[PDB]
Amino acid sequence: TDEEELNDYKLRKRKTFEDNIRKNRTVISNWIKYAQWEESLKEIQRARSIYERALDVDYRNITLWLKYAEMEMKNRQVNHARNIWDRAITTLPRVNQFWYKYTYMEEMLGNVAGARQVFERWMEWQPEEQAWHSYINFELRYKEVDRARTIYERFVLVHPDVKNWIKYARFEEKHAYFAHARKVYERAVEFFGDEHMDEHLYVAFAKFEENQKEFERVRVIYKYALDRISKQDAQELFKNYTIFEKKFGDRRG
Amino acid sequence: KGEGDLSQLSKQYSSRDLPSHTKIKYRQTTQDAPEEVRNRD
Amino acid sequence: WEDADFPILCQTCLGENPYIRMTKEKYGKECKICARPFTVFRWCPGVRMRFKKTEVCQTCSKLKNVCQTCLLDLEYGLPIQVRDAGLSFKDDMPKSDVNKEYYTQNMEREISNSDGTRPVGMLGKATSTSDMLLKLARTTPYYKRNRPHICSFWVKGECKRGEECPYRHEKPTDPDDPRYYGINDPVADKLLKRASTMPRLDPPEDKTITTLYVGGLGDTITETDLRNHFYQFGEIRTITVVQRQQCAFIQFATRQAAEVAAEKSFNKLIVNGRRLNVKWGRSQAA
Amino acid sequence: PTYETMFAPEFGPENPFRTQQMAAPRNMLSGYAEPAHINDFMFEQQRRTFATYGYALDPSLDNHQVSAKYIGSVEEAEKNQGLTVFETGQKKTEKRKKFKENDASNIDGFLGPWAKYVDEEEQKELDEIT
Amino acid sequence: SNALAIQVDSEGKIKY
Amino acid sequence: AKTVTKQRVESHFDLELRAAVMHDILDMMPEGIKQNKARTILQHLSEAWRCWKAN
RNA sequence: AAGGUAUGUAUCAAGCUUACAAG
RNA sequence: GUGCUCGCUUCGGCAGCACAUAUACUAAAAUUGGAACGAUACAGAGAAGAUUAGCAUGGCCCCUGCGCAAGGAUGACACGCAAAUUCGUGAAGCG
Ligand SMILES: [Mg+2]
Ligand SMILES: [Mg+2]
Ligand SMILES: [Zn+2]
Ligand SMILES: [Zn+2]
Ligand SMILES: [Zn+2]
């Protein structure tokens, strides 16, 4: 009667969980514990059914989606996990975790233009900084001169952060990009803060042009100085500007 | 194609559902009937 | 719960008259599976025949592409599990009263409201057919389906009606061999009937018959047709297309793949629209 | 509307991927079902002609584009040469004579139209089956 | 098949 | 459905009052992760009424 | 008339239900 | 079958006219699934001491009732999920 007691255990827990969901159809603890209880049976086509009718009652929670997808991804059913990630991200665009875990899943698989397509869809909704420079970090960790150039001019139109203006000045500090890196500095210098500078762009521009030679480095800190902020700088850096310009040149007597 | 109980599925002819006030008064001309509203100041 | 306009009705249930008169109710009986109130229809097939009303609803017929009263396939005239095993997919449906039963019938009705033209899931695999089922699709059907069932009081010899007893007489049924999927009693005998046909005897040797006298080429079979139908089997050792008799000679290296060709072509390999001609070759240096 | 538009055939290899039945036209899951307005009486007449004698004319619109035959079992139609049921036939053969008592005078002897006609081992097997 | 049917328009990007 | 006759007047006012304060706090709280520990604002409401009757 | 002599389970027939689909 | 017409030649034979397709076919069933009640034996009884009026909410639970009354033990059935606080692991990004 081992079959009898086994099916008794299964039928009593199923009857318990079905009465628990039938009482409260809104708290979703019941569906996730019942569905992962059948996931503990390790061979199922019904825990899929439990989740896929558990989102009829509430599709707007992230927990059910990411738990059903990490269930389907925890097992070898990769096609189904991808096939529910795409409906998760088209149904709920603004939640970051679905995009992150679906990109991460395809990173652990091949780096196919599927993954880049997932990413550019994720770009298309105009997210925050956290996602965008994560995608440029993806393009750097596959060593893309071409594609990290491609996807990062569309960046700056939406985030004009000074922290991001100085890091569109990155082809200098990785490729040195001479003439068009100087054009990146032109793009840095003409935009917002024309007389007010946001007090930070030309610090890093002076750091690179001081890392460069005396090509045209005298101008921007001292002789393009019409654009001051009431003193041209705080007290914290102008003597540092002077000894910044002093001892890194031809040093003529 | 098989509606709820009010349509065909029930013979429960309840009272309070009995053809009371089965014609509608329209607002006639001496009151504020909408033809006399289409121009008033 | 359900109205209708005209029933499904495979051809053996209509009867031999092109002019039949048929009556309808609005909510008739219930479906004998799901207890749903369809619209029962009744008619007379033939002048020696019972009335054979209507057994299941239009929904439970559109699920499995089944006729309306005798519960056979609308495309073939075959039982249900013959079709589903012959198409190797079952299109599941529950067994209990509610447990997913009227739930799934209600919802599959709700997603069948648009078409009303084809079955709900069988449409994709009812195309890749006509190979294993077409050998048993009994056309020119027997109308013993429509004859009225056997009366009592002839069974007890009491029937005072005499001749005008409408039902039948002198057909004592036998209590040894008489639902919707499985299991059904004559279907096991019919699948034993298809598994145990009449072939040619398998001659006592060790697979030497890799050659075979297949012919009736006419103008239908060409050389690349038959050797690409055998290239999926495997490799030849010698082909010829002998057109004095319209025949083709193929062999296999280590017979086995051409073995299933012997299973494929006992007057059975039907490509290009012809019952091909097959008898046994030599494999005897003759 | 023009004849050439609707009568224009379809280009293609007819799509033999399907079965015969699914490629066939329909509106109802079993054949194209459409209304009709036949005369009641000639419907009933040719219906009863088939129901008695096993032959009738065939109903169609576009089968061969010409259809004027008989159907059912063919040869018995021209055995009777196309007569009907409402016709006083060419012969009065194989009739069957009833005995009539239409006086309404005798009691238990009057059978009007209720007249019963002048014509008026298995049980071992039946007991072994039951 | 097991998977869905993949649809992109004739000119533009991948349709979802 | 059933009307609100005189025996369930008082047992319907509480029902609609706590439905109204339920989907007022559901639409008033900002984007924090938990709403009311699933019930606690209602407990403060009923305690506020008990303290009102007891002054 | 209800408002009081609780209801909730487990085995055992008539009441009611179709007299059907069927190699 | 009928009745009528010599209508064609015997009252008889014939011809025409008028009339035009019922039935959930059964007195049965090899029949069929059998749920309610009653019996049998168990379980037994809302609200943090005891005795307790209740009225609700939820739906795959119903009964009585003409019920958009009301009553069926408040008709029954409704239980441990703590969350965020400490800490481990892992990921994404940045310096
Ligand atoms: Mg209660
Ligand atoms: Mg009550
Ligand atoms: Zn049905
Ligand atoms: Zn049928
Ligand atoms: Zn009989």
Quick one: three-class SS letters along C43-55? ECCCCCCCCCCCC
Q: What are phi and psi of E13, to 5 degrees?
A: -100, -175
Give the span between the Cα atoms of C138 and C135, in whole angstroms. Answer: 9
* Residue type present at position A229: I
List residues in chain C that are followed by a break over 2.5 Å (C to N). Answer: 178
Cα dihedral C251, C254, C257, C263 sign:
positive
Q: Which residues contact C179 (CB under 8 A, 6 or more apart)?
A: C33
Do residues C9 and C68 lie in contact, with contact meaning Cβ atoms separated by under 8 Å?
A: yes
Give the span between the Cα atoms of A160 and A157, in whole angstroms. Answer: 6
HSE-CB of A4 using CA atoms within 13 angstroms: 1
Residues of C in contact with D22 (CB under 8 A): 75, 118, 123, 126-127
Beta strand ranges found along chain C (DSSP E) = 22-24, 41-43, 213-215, 240-242, 247-249, 277-279
Give the span between the Cα atoms of C113 and D83, in whole angstroms. Answer: 49
* Mutate: best of B8, B10, B11, partner C, most C CBs <10 A: B8
Method by which the model was determined = cryo-EM
- Tokens, residue A9: 């255990």
Break chain C into its structural domains and give their ranges: 1-147+179-197, 148-178, 198-286
Give the span between the Cα atoms of A205 and A212, in whole angstroms. Answer: 10
Closest CA to D129 of C77, C171, A89: C171
Helices (DSSP H) in A75-212: which residue ranges? 78-91, 96-108, 113-124, 129-140, 145-150, 153-156, 162-168, 178-190, 201-211
Helices (DSSP H) in F1-55: which residue ranges? 10-25, 40-53
Bridge partners (DSSP) of residue D70 are D57
List residues in chain D that are followed by a break over 2.5 Å (C to N). Answer: 120
Give the span between the Cα atoms of C254 and A236, in whole angstroms. Answer: 91
By residue count, chain D amounts to 130
- Tell me how far CA of residue A244 lies from CA of A62, A176, A209, A238, A252, in angstroms: 52, 22, 11, 9, 16
Give the span between the Cα atoms of B5 and C255, in whole angstroms. Answer: 70
Q: Which of the 8 DSSP states describes residue B31?
A: T
Cα D74 from chain centroid (whole Å): 13
Do residues C278 and C214 lie in contact, with contact meaning Cβ atoms separated by under 8 Å?
A: yes
Domain ranges, residue A204: 1-253
Helices (DSSP H) in chain D: which residue ranges? 3-7, 20-23, 40-53, 75-79, 122-129
Helix, strand or coil, per DSSP, at residue C18: coil
Residue of E nearest to A117 (CA): E14
Do residues C205 and C259 lie in contact, with contact meaning Cβ atoms separated by under 8 Å?
A: no
Max Cα distance, chain B (Å)? 53
Q: Work out if C151's Cβ lies within 7 angstroms of strand G.
A: no
Cα dihedral C109, C115, C117, C121 sign:
negative
SS (H, E, C) B3-20: CCCCCCCCCCCCCCCCCC
Give the span between the Cα atoms of A208 and A217, in whole angstroms. Answer: 9
Do residues A98 and A85 lie in contact, with contact meaning Cβ atoms separated by under 8 Å?
A: yes
Q: What are phi and psi of D32, to 5 degrees?
A: -70, 110
Cα dihedral F40, F46, F52, F55 sign:
negative
Q: Work out if F32's Cβ lies within 7 angstroms of strand H.
A: no
Do residues C186 and C81 lie in contact, with contact meaning Cβ atoms separated by under 8 Å?
A: no
Max Cα distance, chain C (Å)? 77
HSE-CB of A39 using CA atoms within 13 angstroms: 20
Angle made by CA atoms C268, C273, C278, in degrees to the nearest 5: 35
- Tokens, residue A46: 């019904």
Give the span between the Cα atoms of D49 and D63, in whole angstroms. Answer: 22
Residues of D in contact with C126 (CB under 8 A): 19, 22
Bridge partners (DSSP) of residue C240 are C249
Give the span between the Cα atoms of A13 and A9, in whole angstroms. Answer: 6
Q: Work out if C168's Cβ lies within 7 angstroms of strand G.
A: no
What would the DSSP string read from start to end of A61-79? Answer: -HHHHHHHHHHHHHSS-HH
Residues of C in contact with B2 (CB under 8 A): 1-3
Cα dihedral A107, A109, A112, A118 sign:
negative
Element (H, E) at C84: helix C80-86
Rounded to a whole number of angstroms, the CA Rg of chain A reads 28
Residue of D nearest to C19 (CA): D47
